[PDB]
Amino acid sequence: AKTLLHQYWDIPEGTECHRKTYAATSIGGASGLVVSAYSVALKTPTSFLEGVARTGRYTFTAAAIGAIFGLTSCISAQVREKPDDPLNYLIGGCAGGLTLGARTRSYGIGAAACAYMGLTAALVKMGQLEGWKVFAEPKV
């Protein structure tokens, strides 16, 4: 939601750490709720306990992506000491992609997820930094 993404972008990046990781786990909980809701809505799990297992798997993967991504975000920003580069989040997106691939227990999914999640996280910080408007103007 607007509230938790605003909590995530409230903190300077910057070193006010592990609030970033908790907000990213909230991102993971929301994403897992979305995917799990549609997945149990469009499967007929047969039976409900296996549906609980599927929902738990998706939420655990999304929360793990959020947690690992927030940790590497904060750590890379503390080490490189430059709170304006997108390259630290490039490294963060690749790390999140590799851990997604490892929890799905593969190699190629992990490498392609590294590449695409890194480039998209770079685009996220790059647009938040230079200034690209969220979802509308809506003016002309």
Partner 1 sequence: MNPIILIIILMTVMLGTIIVMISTHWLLIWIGFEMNMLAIIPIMMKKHNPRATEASTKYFLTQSTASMLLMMAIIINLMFSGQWTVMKLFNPMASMLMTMALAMKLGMAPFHFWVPEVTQGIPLSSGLILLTWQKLAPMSVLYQILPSINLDLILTLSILSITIGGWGGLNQTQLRKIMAYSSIAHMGWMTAVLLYNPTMTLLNLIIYIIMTSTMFTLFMANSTTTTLSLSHTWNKAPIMTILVLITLLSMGGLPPLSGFMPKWMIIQEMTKNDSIILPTLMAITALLNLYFYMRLTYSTALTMFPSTNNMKMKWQFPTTKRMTLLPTMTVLSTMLLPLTPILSILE
Partner 2 sequence: LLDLIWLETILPKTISLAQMKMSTTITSQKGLIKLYFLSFLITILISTTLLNFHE
Partner 3 sequence: MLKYIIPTMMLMPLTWLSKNSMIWINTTLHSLLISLTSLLLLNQFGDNSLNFSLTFFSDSLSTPLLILTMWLLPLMLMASQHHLSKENLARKKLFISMLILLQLFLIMTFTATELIFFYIMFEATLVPTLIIITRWGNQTERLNAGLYFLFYTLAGSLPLLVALIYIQNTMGSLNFLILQYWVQPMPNSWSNTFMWLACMMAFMVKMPLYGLHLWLPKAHVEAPIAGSMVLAAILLKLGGYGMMRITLLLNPITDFMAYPFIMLSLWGMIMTSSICLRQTDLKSLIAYSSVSHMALVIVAILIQTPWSYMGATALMIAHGLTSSMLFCLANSNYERVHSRTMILARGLQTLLPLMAAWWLLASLTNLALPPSINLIGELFVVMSTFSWSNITIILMGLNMVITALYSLYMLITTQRGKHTHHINNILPSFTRENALMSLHMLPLLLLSLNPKIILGPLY
Ligand X SMILES: CCCCCCCCCCCCCCCCCC(=O)OC[C@H](COP(=O)([O-])OCC[N+](C)(C)C)OC(=O)CCCCCCCCCCCCCCCCC
Note the residues at the interface with partner 2 (CB under 8 A): 1-2, 30, 33-34, 37-38, 41-42, 44, 112
Residue 53 contact, options partner 2, partner 3, ligand X, none, Cβ 5-8 Å cut-off depending on partner type = none
Binding-site size, partner 1 (CB under 8 A): 9
What binding mask, one character per residue, do residues 107-126 give for partner 3 by CB under 8 A, x or -? -------------------x
Of residues 118 through 137, those in contact with ligand X by CB under 6 A are: 123, 131-132
Concatenating the DSSP letter of every residue in 84-140 gives T-SHHHHHHHHHHHHHHHHHTT-SHHHHHHHHHHHHHHHHHHHHHHHT--SS-----
Residue 129 contact, options partner 2, partner 3, ligand X, none, Cβ 5-8 Å cut-off depending on partner type = partner 3
Q: Quote the CA–CA distance of 89 and 25 in Å, as a whole number.
A: 16
Other beta carbons within 10 angstroms of residue 13's beta carbon come to 19
Shorter beta-carbon distance to partner 1: residue 60 or 132: 132
DSSP classification of residue 15 = S
Binding residues (CB under 8 A) for partner 3: these are 126, 129-130
Which residues contact ligand X (rule: CB under 6 A)? Answer: 123, 131-132
